[PDB]
Amino acid sequence: GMTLAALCQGVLERLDPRQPGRQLVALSGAPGSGKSTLSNPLAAALSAQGLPAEVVPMDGFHLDNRLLEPRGLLPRKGAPETFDFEGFQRLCHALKHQERVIYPLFDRARDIAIAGAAEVGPECRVAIIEGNYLLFDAPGWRDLTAIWDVSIRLEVPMADLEARLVQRWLDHGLNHDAAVARAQGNDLANARAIEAARLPADLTWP
């Protein structure tokens, strides 16, 4: 019930042109929410209105499997406790007042996070930070809401998330039974934890 145009305008109205440094806009979804398909056009819309914006994903902050494994966390990769929270938090802080900030990008195919893979530069006025746990009512995570200048929740029904996740796994070459089991495991449990621990957003799409 909201157009991208109205989303862009709503973000702009809520930002403060007089505010020193870089502004942060959070877009929080769940696994399967397709959040990157919203954040990127939003970045482009804002840039077109004279606010150069870029999308900064949180995925680069996954711990490596070599850490997760001995901790018994490997089967839950994607869960909040499988992220470098303190490192992500440090990035969010750096983005406000550092001119130039290097950060990691997650390589899905290789199932690793690559350090030194991306940079937010001084020309960027707004960072749209996208992730699953940006409005998440848990220790540490809940403190992030204080950092955001504007926050957006991407709201997708659980049923829709599931279907999208199964397709994901089907694409990966899993058969249907397997794809369902895989999705119903981790991803959907995370989606559920997210729904169970919602912090309020400035704006909700759609």
Number of domains in the chain: 1
Domain with residue 189: its CATH number is 3.40.50.300
Confirm if 161 and 33 have CB atoms less than 8 A apart: yes
Q: Which residue has the tokens 């806009």?
A: 25
Question: Which residue type does 50 have?
Answer: G
Resolution of the coordinates in A?
2.0
Residue 149's φ and ψ, nearest 5 degrees, are -90, -35
> Please, what is the angle between helix 158-171 and helix 176-184, to 10°?
130
**Distance of alpha carbon 71 from its chain centroid, rounded?**
24
Q: Which two tokens stand for residue 154?
A: 């991407």
**CA pair distance 131, 13, nearest whole angstrom:** 23
Q: Which residue has the tokens 């989606």?
A: 191
Contacts of 69 (CB under 8 A, 6+ apart): none
**CA pair distance 31, 53, nearest whole angstrom:** 23
Residue 187 belongs to domain spanning: 1-206
**Distance of alpha carbon 109 from its chain centroid, rounded?**
18
Confirm if 193 and 79 have CB atoms less than 8 A apart: yes
The terminus-to-terminus CA distance of the chain in angstroms comes to: 6
**CA pair distance 52, 43, nearest whole angstrom:** 8
Asked how this structure was determined, the answer is: X-ray
Closest CA to 31 of 201, 195, 204, 190: 190
